[PDB]
Amino acid sequence: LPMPMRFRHLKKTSKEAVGVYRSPIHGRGLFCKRNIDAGEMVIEYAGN
Amino acid sequence: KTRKESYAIYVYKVLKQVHPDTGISSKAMSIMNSFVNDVFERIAGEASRLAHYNKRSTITSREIQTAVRLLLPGELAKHAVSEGTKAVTCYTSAK
Amino acid sequence: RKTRKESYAIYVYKVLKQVHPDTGISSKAMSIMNSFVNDVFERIAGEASRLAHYNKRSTITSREIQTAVRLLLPGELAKHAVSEGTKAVTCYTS
Amino acid sequence: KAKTRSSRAGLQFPVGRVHRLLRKGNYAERVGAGAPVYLAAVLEYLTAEILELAGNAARDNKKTRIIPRHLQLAVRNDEELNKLLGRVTIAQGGVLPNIQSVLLP
Amino acid sequence: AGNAARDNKKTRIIPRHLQLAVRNDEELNKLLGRVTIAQGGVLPNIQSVLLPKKTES
Amino acid sequence: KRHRKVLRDNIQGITKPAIRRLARRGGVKRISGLIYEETRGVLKVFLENVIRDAVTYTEHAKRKTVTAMDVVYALKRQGRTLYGFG
Amino acid sequence: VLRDNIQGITKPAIRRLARRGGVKRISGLIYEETRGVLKVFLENVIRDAVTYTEHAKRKTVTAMDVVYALKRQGRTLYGFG
Amino acid sequence: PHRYRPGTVALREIRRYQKSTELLIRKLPFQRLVREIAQDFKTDLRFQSSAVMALQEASEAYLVALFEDTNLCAIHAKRVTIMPKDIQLARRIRGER
Amino acid sequence: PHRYRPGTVALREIRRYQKSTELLIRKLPFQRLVREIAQDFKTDLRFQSSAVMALQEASEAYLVALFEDTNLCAIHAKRVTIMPKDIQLARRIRGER
DNA sequence: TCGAGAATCCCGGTGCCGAGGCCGCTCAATTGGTCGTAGACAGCTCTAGCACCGCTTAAACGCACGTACGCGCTGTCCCCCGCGTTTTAACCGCCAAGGGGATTACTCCCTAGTCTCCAGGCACGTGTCAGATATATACATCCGA
DNA sequence: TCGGATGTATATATCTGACACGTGCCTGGAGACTAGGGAGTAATCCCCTTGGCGGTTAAAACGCGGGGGACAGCGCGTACGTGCGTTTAAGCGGTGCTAGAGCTGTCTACGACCAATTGAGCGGCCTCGGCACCGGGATTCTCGA
């Protein structure tokens, strides 16, 4: 697939893909729930 | 207290004229009844879509013949076409 | 001068400009959408006519069209198109 | 003065019932006058074909009254009737005897 | 169709966008089951074992 | 109330000489052990995709019984035509 | 009258259809089997196309006849007529 | 101490089951299955019996055709034992999924 | 002296051909094929052009679907190279033969 | 752990021809009536479906258990694949000649429809034989030594 | 190679209950007429299809050389038939009752049917911007050490 269609896919599914929970490493961390194939987009690290 | 469109006596008579000394059960009669209804619906529906495609408003012998040549496979198609044309000519000559 | 033929080009133009402001369409895409609407119309009218022959009635009401759409379309798309149809008919009545 | 069209054409399946089923069935506006005759002929031929291939299996397996297993075998053994009745589950059917040739010991 | 037509940076809609728009969706692909769009093409799909992988170093 | 319809089984009710028996009508020599669950899944999918259209015709006819013609009509739509019940 | 044109389908063109199919590596008998399957499918379409053309009395096979035949086959080509 | 070489009972059951026609699945568990999955579309229906027999014939024929195409797959992979990746291949190829 | 490891040109041609849409078979040999096998059913016909293009689209789509199901078979048999028993298996399973 | 290198995606100039839009002008959609029968409905059966019951018994499940083959490993080899060099027909662009396909105008005769009459099919009551079932019984054939 | 030791078609006696067959009766299928409207037929013109000839070149054809997957051979123990014993749910009769399917009048209101009207929608003809092509730098993997 080309780039912006998967960018649309990203803005769709980044909510249902991942999750922030209580880590044993250090405080909290970002988990993973959907089984990800090697190469796809996960989330956009956006802010101010 | 009703009526029913079965083809039992007709398949009886055809079975008499193709095997002189056998009969047929109920379930086989129902299977042949559904078979004749299904073949009738497929041939009539293909003919009707021909009549609608060609912008004309009458099903004739030529459209039924083209429905037969489309729907059936080869050797059985030539047999059925010859049987139908024989029946139509013997209908209309001695009409 | 040619004999006037049916087409659904203008209505696809209108729905396209209602759902996208500045996105045109080609010719081949217009022929595809024409044949697509012809397909869906043939299937739904066939199912409704077969229902009318099964039920020993003689008149296509809206009820048979609703039943044909609920049969032929898969799941959630049917649950939206039923609502679209009912809303259009009830806005047509009053 | 009552010559039925089955007699007047020489066939066995009726033509009046076919004419009534065409006019009632809403298949088109005008039914012809020879088309139900022609179709009665075609139906009579295919019924004759299936019963002809039925009766051979009936006499070969020693019974004298045709059963749906005989009908299943009479349909499925043929080359072109199998292409006509493409996918039809016949009730009480069963299948053709066939074992793959790479499983015999 | 309009979303894909913007997202490949084109103005109009050519039928490749229609092929992608139907076959990416799930229910419209089930509706258009036995259908071939002219000039359509297919989805880009390569199997998982036809491409190499590296072990050493 | 009055209606006792708490049912959880009956996917296991298709027992396990039965799929073996169907396989050996099919001409199958030796079967693994996951075929049982996979066959139960496929059977559930198919019976859902027939019972849906059967109940739709039964409701549209405004009745409460699903006569045999409606099942024949559902299977006629699916492509698996059935003979011998009309 | 014509001849040999089933070999008009080349060796690379079948390879190109294989690449669009997503195929790594081909043997040397696929060419013969592919020409067989393609000739069978073209006969089964062109028979019904010419049957429609003979019924409508014309001597021309338009696109609408091909689309009607493909509608009967169960393939339903869009984008013409 | 008399036991067969394994496979003989398999082949004789294949011929023994292909030489007959009957309902093969026991009828009341299949009827309870049909009513239980018909619960989800309209509550408290009322079947006939011939509709249940028609469903049993359709499902029996579909499973038999599926297993024969599965067995073709498993013989193609130079094996004998059927594994469920064969069934999933067959329903992927046929077009039902 | 610079040559690729074998297979790289294959995978890049796969992506290069899936990123495009056109007629793929050269048009005049396919037109001569269609006229030559249409000879046998009615002598001296007269085609249009759009009917020939429709035939080319239908045949192209049928061959592409056939090769993808063939490639599924060949990967199922723990191989990579396609052999014609795969194609004959696919047309046996699908129901066209 | 590297670097030669060969495509490759991203980027902006030059040109052109498919697409959007606008006027004109029809002919089918709209409005306004009548009029009949298809259907909604109240009522009135009476018949299959569901639930219940005990009883009998083919059939399903658990458990050893021997074994054979799916799977894993290794070798070897040959044939398919990159690539360089060589022809050749695909294509384009063109002119050219004529077959045939929509199109309209015009008789015309085939069928939708109506009225009369009457036997072909159908629901129903008959007896009565085709194949199921039971019982021995020669006879094919699987498997160790 | 044989003995044994299995299950398997095979000759016959008896029933039954499902199937072959009169019968009457009726309602839908043959006889007559009548109009009119869909379809057969002549003509045409003008659109499109088919055919032919030279020019460029993209692409097919064809050897070369090789190394990587197809295939054969071999070892094991995990997994699955085979059988035996040990439970259970599946048929199977009778019963009932009853909710609901099916059937009969009865009366409308909703859709067919037809007359007069105009504006929605197709055809022809402009115009001009998105897209196609050319050409060059950044990037991004591959493959020999």
UniProtKB/Swiss-Prot annotation, chain A:
Impact upon substituting residue 48 to T: Leads to stable interaction with ASH2L and RBBP5 in the absence of WDR5
Subcellular location, record wording: Nucleus
Phenotype for residue 45 to A: Impairs methyltransferase activity toward unmodified or monomethylated H3K4me
Residues that bind S-adenosyl-L-methionine: 26, 28
Protein's name in the database: MLL cleavage product C180
Species in which this protein is naturally found: Homo sapiens
Primary gene name: KMT2A
Residues of the full protein shown: 3814 to 3861 of 3969
UniProtKB/Swiss-Prot annotation, chain B:
Major localisation: nucleus
Modifications the protein undergoes after translation, according to the UniProt entry: It fluctuates in response to extracellular glucose, and associates with transcribed genes.
Record has Nucleus as a keyword: yes
Any Gene Ontology CC annotation: nucleus
Top-level taxon in the UniProt lineage: Eukaryota
GO molecular function, one term: protein heterodimerization activity
Summary of subunit composition and partner proteins: The nucleosome is a histone octamer containing two molecules each of H2A, H2B, H3 and H4 assembled in one H3-H4 heterotetramer and two H2A-H2B heterodimers. The octamer wraps approximately 147 bp of DNA.
The protein's role, per its UniProt record: Core component of nucleosome. Nucleosomes wrap and compact DNA into chromatin, limiting DNA accessibility to the cellular machineries which require DNA as a template. Histones thereby play a central role in transcription regulation, DNA repair, DNA replication and chromosomal stability. DNA accessibility is regulated via a complex set of post-translational modifications of histones, also called histone code, and nucleosome remodeling.
Family per record: Belongs to the histone H2B family.
Name used for this protein in its record: Histone H2B 1.1
Species assigned in the record: Xenopus laevis (African clawed frog)
Section of the entire sequence shown: 32 to 126 of 126
Swiss-Prot record, chain F:
Disulfide bonds: none
Cross-link entry Glycyl lysine isopeptide (Lys-Gly) (interchain with G-Cter in ubiquitin), positions: 76
List of residues that carry N6-methylated lysine: 5
Molecular-function GO terms, alphabetical: DNA binding; protein heterodimerization activity; structural constituent of chromatin
Residue positions, PTM N6-propionyllysine: 1, 16, 29, 62, 64, 76
Modified-residue entries (N6-lactoyllysine), positions: 1, 16, 62, 76
Sequence positions bearing N6-glutaryllysine: 16, 44, 62, 64, 76
Listed name of the protein: Histone H4
Species: Xenopus laevis (African clawed frog)
